[model samples]
Target chain A: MDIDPYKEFGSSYQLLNFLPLDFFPDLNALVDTATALYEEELTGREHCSPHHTAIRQALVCWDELTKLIAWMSSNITSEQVRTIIVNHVNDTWGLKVRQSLWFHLSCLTFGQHTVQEFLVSFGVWIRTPAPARPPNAPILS
Target chain B: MDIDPYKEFGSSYQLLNFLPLDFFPDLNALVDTATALYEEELTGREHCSPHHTAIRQALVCWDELTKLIAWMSSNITSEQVRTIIVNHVNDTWGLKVRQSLWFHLSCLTFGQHTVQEFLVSFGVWIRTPAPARPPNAPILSTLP
Candidate 1:
């Protein structure tokens, strides 16, 4: 259940749009994804293969990354939060975090998840520009 | 299928070493991942998801990122390279690049992928101390 970036961010976007604003939908999703490791049950079957190992890595980084990103901090601005992200914006912590986010995003985006969904938990959704309010429905009645 | 960052950057790291070296493994994997969207045959069935949609996004960024960071350029320094990052590195071309790298690394570290893989793709490595070389035997008895 990810939102669609292709549907939202669109075919083209300005670089500035990547920034994480208070409305950064992605922040919420990533936090949830990060939390998922704790929320999820495991077989201790990681550190061996591609899938579980990757899952294991995502779990650690997601937790640490979410904590470091502190995306929930009040009043952060697009100007203020124009974050690069580790994909969790894990780059908020650095390379490892970035990889963690990317790995999951890669799979989620390519696999069962959507970038927008990941952007929201394989979670992510960056804020799209809000549509302008219609001029009071042109009250010409 | 995917370049291993740990193998690329030496079995691993936790930092966003956003150095755009020739061998940055993560970059390659991401580029590969991005490209897979195009390369992959679609049956609409996936654990690798649709590939193309996400692939579209990754491809654009990867091309832009690689060029800006100059992964192919020569002799970039660690301190010099560590120059950009932290999505707040506020989402500078530098931070975004680093962040992208970080995003990959985060999952790789916790998951199946490795920083070495990315390092290899990105062609950069963390400043770890090198190991000592093994001694050659001169017919001497070895100590327990």
Candidate 2:
């Protein structure tokens, strides 16, 4: 019978290190912050229909991700399977995913088209660095 | 400003007292048990396609409910909203809901069509009791 790597210790499955486990708590805080802002806007009883719609959609996406994360936390028990799951999440839900989410939310707050734009609007410079080239690689002639 | 009951403490909104908070832990246990069974079945190297399908669907439904319950738990943090959420869950997810879930899961272990049938198949009787009639109501008629 073929062996299942999921049942073995220290399986060959390598985890992607793009997204940290902090994703959970960070997402929790984001959801809570967005929820509070939504409620605050509603409380003001303003005529911000378009902005409210953006926030609502952002909330929906955030909620869906939160639910998925909860399922991931509960269902993956095996260490190897857990690593596989974490790797899959990190590979799929990286900075671009978060930036899109932030863009939707920024529509309500800053009307910015991207997370970097939203942050830079407030003088923050959180940039992704370019990949490094190999030391042995020759420079352009 | 209009008053929202969810924001008010001791809101006049009453809660339906049916399902308990224990439902969360119970469902966690149930999902873990079903997952264990599924892994065990897969490990045995047996030709149980139909049974595997049933378990898979059952797991899907259970997982969906677990995801929903997690959302419900996280979204409803206010005291009154919590009560409202609990009441909604209790009224909607009563014995019949549990029975339906159990019925789907029971198909994997037993070929029974109903939860009651599955339980009684194992010599266990878990019957819902008849509601107590009001003192002024007569018990003569069986149907309206």
Candidate 3:
């Protein structure tokens, strides 16, 4: 099968990487140029100028690619599953308020309920090492 | 809030209406011009040239913008929503395989379930135009 560079990071993870950041100046520059061209296109000032069209087209392509990658990765492993969980948590919370607990709860609930159960158990095992007990003490019920 | 031009069947949509048909021809012309200008960029006498980056960039940009508009239009009213759904469904399914459906379904399921649910009802209403069921009908079960 043909390898997709995007499949490496997964869709949502890829988009998160592409979103504005101080580290990736080229991506930011591209977004800025594209946004300006988009605005101009929206205003009818450019009226389908090649530059405007090119930039707009690039954005659409990126979006579609992102969506496609996300979709394809939905059934795969890696960051795609993480992204989907994060998105589901965000959706469950809605826009009114931020809830940190939702993140943990989502990890516990959906993670345990779905194919990601191993991850949930592994996380718990790592974060809370087995409690120490007295060598001679009888096991508590 | 700034009104998205793609919100309605605006100029951006009109521009897109011509893109898929024009894209390959434009890319071929660009490749021809780029090859003539920068023959060194060519890998060999006969093969795809490195100068094809121009067309690749154009294709990427177009795809991104199409996605942006699609995302933007997700929150609009019934009529527009129905139109978009039909176009999107046809575009995804009318092809040899439903390549785009995975992405569309993911976005709808994970990103815009509420809006998608709304559109589902809207589609039903459009198909059966008489009794107006509540928008949330699908989510509920009528009890005895």
TM-score of chain A of each: 0.27, 0.39, 0.31
Candidate 3 Cα misplacement greater than 4 A, ranges: A1-25, A36-46, A80-141, B1-144
lDDT of candidate 1 over B1-144, digit per residue (tens): 122223322233334444533323434454444334324422122323222222323333434334323421232224432343223323433333334444443443343244335434443223432353233211211111
For each candidate, give the interface RMSD after superposing the true interface residues on Cα.
12.1, 19.5, 12.6
The TM-score-based order of candidates, best leading, equals: 2, 1, 3
- Score chain B of candidate 3 by TM-score: 0.23
lDDT of candidate 1 over A1-141, digit per residue (tens):
222223323111222234333323343455355345422322332222233334443343334334433542333423333343223233232333343344444444355233333444211123332363332211101
Tens digits of per-residue lDDT for model 3 on A71-127? 434533247544653354233211101111122222223441331343333333444
Candidate 1: Cα lDDT at B68: 28
Model 2's CAPRI class is incorrect
- Locate the minimum summed-lDDT window of 10 residues in model 3 chain B: B95-104
Residue pairs with backbone overlap in model 2: none
* Deviation of model 1 at B31, angstroms: 4.5
Query: Per lDDT, what order, best first?
Result: 2, 1, 3
lDDT leader: 2
Better of 1 and 2 by lDDT: 2
**Candidate 1 — which residues are off by over 4 angstroms?**
A1-141, B1-22, B25-38, B41-44, B49-144
Quote the RMSD, in angstroms, for model 3.
22.1
Tell me the tens digit of each residue's lDDT in model 2 across B33-142: 55655666533333244334333323333344444545445642446644554455444443323433333344555543342332332221112333533333111111
On TM-score, the candidate that comes out on top is 2
